[PDB]
Each structure stands twice: as C-alpha cells, then as structure tokens.
Amino acid sequence: SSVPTKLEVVAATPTSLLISWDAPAVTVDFYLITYGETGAAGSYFQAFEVPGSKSTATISGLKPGVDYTITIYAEYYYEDGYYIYSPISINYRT
Amino acid sequence: PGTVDKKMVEKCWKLMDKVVRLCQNPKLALKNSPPYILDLLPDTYQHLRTILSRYEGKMETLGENEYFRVFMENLMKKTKQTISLFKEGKERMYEENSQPRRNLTKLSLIFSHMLAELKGIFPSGLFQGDTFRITKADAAEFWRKAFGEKTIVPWKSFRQALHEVHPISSGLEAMALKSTIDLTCNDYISVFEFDIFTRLFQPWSSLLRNWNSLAVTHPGYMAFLTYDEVKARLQKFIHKPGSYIFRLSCTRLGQWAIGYVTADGNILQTIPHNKPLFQALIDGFREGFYLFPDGRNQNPDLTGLC
C-alpha cells in the first residue's frame, strides 16, 4: 500500500501528460515525480518536485509512441532529512 | 506535543543561528525584501528572549503551553528543513531561479508568518492565546462555540467543526483550504491563523464560497507576492491595458492588494481599504480597470457573492 494511493492520467497529448493522485491521510511535505521510457536506465529520467498540497502535475517533452514509466514518491521530513513512503507508478503510452 | 525546557530552546537558537550563517554567504546575495530571513530569525530569537524574561521563574508552566510546545517543535522542524535544504541544494543555491532558491523563499515566508503568530499569541512576551479576540464576531462565535479557550486545534478537528458550518466536498478542496489557512504548516490551526483567514474571505456567511471564488478558481489570485513582484509580473502585459492581479502581503496579514496596467502605460497598485475584495474587483471591473486577470481575456464573475 503506497502513497499516493491512486495515480492516473487525465489529459493526453502526443508530447504531454496530465497526471493526478489522491489527497493523502498522511502528511506529505513534497512529491518527487519521475519519468522515462520503460525498460530504460535511471540516467534517462528526469525528475522534478511538487508541493504536498498539490494533486496534479504536467509532464511535457515526451516523444510520441513511447512507453513511459511514471513514479510518484512522497517525502516527509524527519529529524534527519526527507524520507519516503512506498511509491506508486503507472506505465503510459503516448 | 512534547514539553519545552530551556535546553531545547538553546538547541533551537543554535539551529536558527546556523541557518543565519548559511544565509550570510555573499554568493547567496539574498534579497532585501520580506520575507528577509536574516531579519526574521534574529527577530524571532529576540521575541523568544522577551518571553523567557517574563516566564523567568515560571519556566515549568511555559514548557506545558500547548501552543508554545507546538510552536517550538515546528520552529525546530522548519529550521532543520532549511539546513538540509542547503545541504542537498548545494551550489544550486547561489543560482537564483534554481528551485532550491524557490523553496528557500517559501520557508522564508513561513518563518515570517510564524513570527507574526508568536508576537500575536505572546504580545509583550506573555501568553494571551486564551484571550485572543478574533476580529469577526461571526467567526469569533464559531471559534469559541467549537473549541472555547483553545489557541490551537489539530487540523482534522478544525476540518470537522468547520465542515458542519461550511461543508467541504472533497479532500482535494480540503487540502487547498489547508494550504490557505495553515500559514505555519504544522497541521494545526491557531486562533491567529483563523482570524487572518476569516478576515480575507469574509462574510462569515459565505466563507468557503468566497474562498473558492477569490483563491481556488481565480486566475488573478497570486497568494503572497511582494510589491515589486506584483509589478514585475505585470510588466509582461504593458501592451494589454486593464490586465490585473491581486495578492497577499506578508507584512500586512489579513489584507488584500491589487495591481493593474493602465492605458497610460503604467503599472499601478491599489488597496480596497473599504469594500470586500470581491466588491473592489466588481467596481473596478465596471470601472474598466480589472478586465484581464493575469493578462487573460476571461475575467471571473464575482456577482453572486452579494
């Protein structure tokens, strides 16, 4: 059981995707969103960060016909640094 | 929630001071303008002193003040968040548009609100959160009818109580509202935060509706900008007379400010001293000034709030 609990694409374009997730019952300080062609290496993502007060994000620059894997990580600060809950990922063909 | 003594306060000062040294870096070259962190942490520290001198003998009583405990643990938590921001942002902190710099200014805002909330609950250094007088009697009555003497309520409590008076459709709408009221970002609403909010989106009678029309679904709402941020953003639309925006001020909490682009090629700012912001917008729209919210052609309808 991850955080966020559900992730979906709501608008589409050959080069753009609009993604949305739930509002949490836990505290999130920030989300780290990543994307890249599925079955590729990490050198090929491309990540960015969104407040924990947001439920949607826009990804652009994706070449069409390509299978992407998209991950949301949820980060809470502890006395150390930011730590994450389990993550949720979807695979999306533009 | 856990209890504050002097030792933990000294740790808090040393952490703030560490952040201060980090932000004194020449290569940072930090802004003059509020929220100016290198004034906020010194000022927060010194007000904390003024509290300590008042509760000089009465230290055990103060370590139990629920507001004071929540505030000291959040202050701890914020200054830690910031030090760790410098550590992971690293050299990217000396480039101004890097996102780490954005987060640094965001937390600068939070430190600012926190200072105003402390001075608001501890005027002259002595607790007055049980006798805080909410400016709006309609809102004052809600606060005391639901929580009484309390100075600070957990967010889910406040969520439930308010939901019975002004219901909320979704946790989405809830999280946006949370974003707005909880200026201190600790999951607690204070009587200070609540006062401010209930002043921005009065009438009480239609609180959340006013909040949705002016904040959630208005392209002209800017949250906290500075004066020169207002004009710097409207500098993009000199060609478009009547493009307008409105903002919140970190120095004048509970107040609105507006800026628009004139037909003379100027960018001028105004304050609706008398008129709820929706009326000031309505008048100024009919008056031919607030035509284009954020340089956009469709201007939202704020009739139906009357």
- Using H for helix, E for strand and C for coil, what is the string for B5-17? CHHHHHHHHHHHH
Which amino acid belongs to residue B285? F
**Experimentally, how was this structure solved?**
X-ray
Chain A: closest CA distance from residue B301 (Å): 25
CA-based nearest residue to A65, from A10, A15, A8, A18: A15
Domain boundary, last residue among B94, B121, B148? B121
Q: The tokens of B22 are what? A: 């980090």
Domain boundary, last residue among B177, B198, B215? B215
Give me the domain span that covers residue B239. Answer: 216-295
Domain boundary, last residue among B215, B248, B265? B215
Whether chain A has a CB inside 8 Å of the CB on B84: the answer is: yes
Which amino acid belongs to residue B119? K
In a domain, B305, yes or no: no
B214 contacts B206 by C-beta, under 8 angstroms: no
- Same domain, yes or no: B196 and B245: no
CB contact under 8 A, A23 and B171: yes
**A49-to-A5, A30, A57, B155, B189 alpha-carbon distances in Å:** 18, 7, 10, 25, 26
In terms of phi and psi (left: phi > 0; alpha: psi -120 to 50; beta: otherwise), the region of B185 is left
In a domain, B130, yes or no: no
- Helix B191-200 / helix B137-147 crossing angle, nearest 10 deg: 150
CA distance A28 to A23: 10
Whether chain B has a CB inside 8 Å of the CB on A47: the answer is: no
CB contact under 8 A, B84 and A77: yes
- Same domain, yes or no: B101 and B14: yes
Nearest C-alpha in A relative to B88: A81
Residue A40, strand partner residues? none
Cβ contacts of A53 on chain B, cutoff 8 Å: 175-176, 178-179
A22 contacts A71 by C-beta, under 8 angstroms: no
Experimental structure resolution, Å: 3.0
Nearest C-alpha in B relative to A22: B172
| Nearest-by-Cβ selection for B80 from A27, A49, A79 | A79
Chain B: closest CA distance from residue A24 (Å): 8
Q: How far apart are the first and last CA of chain B?
A: 43
CA-CA-CA-CA torsion sign (B126, B132, B135, B139) = positive
